[PDB]
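Support case: chloride ion complex. Customer-provided input:
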Amino acid sequence: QQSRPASDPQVVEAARKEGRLIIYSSTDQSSAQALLDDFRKLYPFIQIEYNDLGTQAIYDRFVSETAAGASSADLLWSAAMELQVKLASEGYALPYDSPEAKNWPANARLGNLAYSTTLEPAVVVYNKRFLKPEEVPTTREGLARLLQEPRMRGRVATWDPERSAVGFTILKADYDRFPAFQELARAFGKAQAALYSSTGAAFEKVISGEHYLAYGFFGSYALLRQRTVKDLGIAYLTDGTVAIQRVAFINKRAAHPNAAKLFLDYLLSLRGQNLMAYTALIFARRETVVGEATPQALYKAVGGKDKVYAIPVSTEILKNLDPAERMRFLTFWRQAVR
Ligand SMILES: [Cl-]
Ligand SMILES: [Cl-]
Ligand SMILES: [Cl-]
Ligand SMILES: [Cl-]
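Agent response - structure generated as follows:
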């Protein structure tokens, strides 16, 4: 007793003829594997080429291949929201109204061009051998107070927003939405915060104890690592949570557009959103999913849906690519943290 995605039978038959699907994705293949296996159970006639790539790498390969008239991906799935919206904003995406997106929220799609697949909170993580939960504040002001402690000097990690597309988006959204972020950033400076472009490199120092606490990394990644890392703790912010959305679109110039429609539909479905939340611990976008990596669990943890600010799948976020907008944030950031 399972659902299938509500893909049009004619799209299924055109996909059967294509026989192939090429994905460029920022989602770790180990994370996506159960999704890929389940999709191939539904559609065994589709061979998948899954290209696990960094966000900038995805954008550069896609626009370079397109520019040269080389064949490129059928489907782009990336946590770099502004780069994905920029490509859809510029006519790279195939217009497609997914039958699985009828109730997709407004801040979760750019018309019939690009869709959110996830709703992923920026959280606090910590090493349980060095900080007890009672020592870990759940507000920006609390964290700024913790980072005044001499013993927290050198013991904090966060993003380097100058070397991560995704770290920029999260910390810029924080800076734009929460006044208390400015007091927290100065505290990063006091505490000699180390800045990472890799969530993995940041978590390695937290796990080893070189840092005790990390700010601004994805709840999805933290829950996944908890499956095997028993010392990693998660604290959800109760004064306001920024959430990012992994955006998918179909290449207008896809060789296999109908296979890509099936895969998009699959990702937005009840079936695909549940499997993603259950297997990958990637926080779902779909509001009805049940489990820890879901909007309902997240709203409960932060004290309500009104405490979550979803970065929207909208051309408004292209202001983050304007140097004038970047500079006000980055000037404050460089000063506060060094
Ligand atoms: Cl359509
Ligand atoms: Cl990583
Ligand atoms: Cl925990
Ligand atoms: Cl929904």
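The chain has two domains: 1-118+245-321, 119-244+322-338.

Case will auto-close in a few days if no follow-up is received.
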